Amino acid sequence: CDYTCGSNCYSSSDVSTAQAAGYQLHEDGETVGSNSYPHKYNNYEGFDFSVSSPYYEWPILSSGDVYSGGSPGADRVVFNENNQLAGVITHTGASGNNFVECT
Ligand SMILES: Nc1nc2c(ncn2[C@@H]2O[C@H](CO)[C@@H](O)[C@H]2OP(=O)(O)O)c(=O)[nH]1
Ligand code: NA
Ligand code: NA
């Protein structure tokens, strides 16, 4: 696994595919789903991302398909304004409504 979010296993191609879809919607000024993804990720957790902000979060799904407006699940891809990958985060293993980084 390139990224492990709890029990979910993601390759760098699964991440690139998810990011490309979130980035396109972001540029278009449109969102999908009841929680309106993609949307800004503030970095309250204080992850040390090596690319610049602003950051946006978009769901990445364990099933392998691109998020298509249903349940976002626990996992997210985080990307910035230049379509650079910041990281992959999850609610799995985090307390409250915080996130932890996938490893
Ligand atoms: N845990 C977490 N939630 C965030 C972050 N950025 C935005 N959100 C949350 O995502 C949702 C969409 O904006 C809001 O509930 C917002 O929470 P706050 O209301 O606390 O800002 C972040 O860095 N961490
Ligand atoms: Na809009
Ligand atoms: Na809890």
Author numbering: 2 to 104
Q: From the publication, what sentences describe this entry?
A:
In using LSSR target restraints it is sensible to ensure that the high-resolution target structure has as good a structure as possible.
To provide easy-to-use automated NCS restraints, it was decided to adopt a different approach that uses interatomic distances rather than structural superposition, extending the ideas used in the SHELX program.
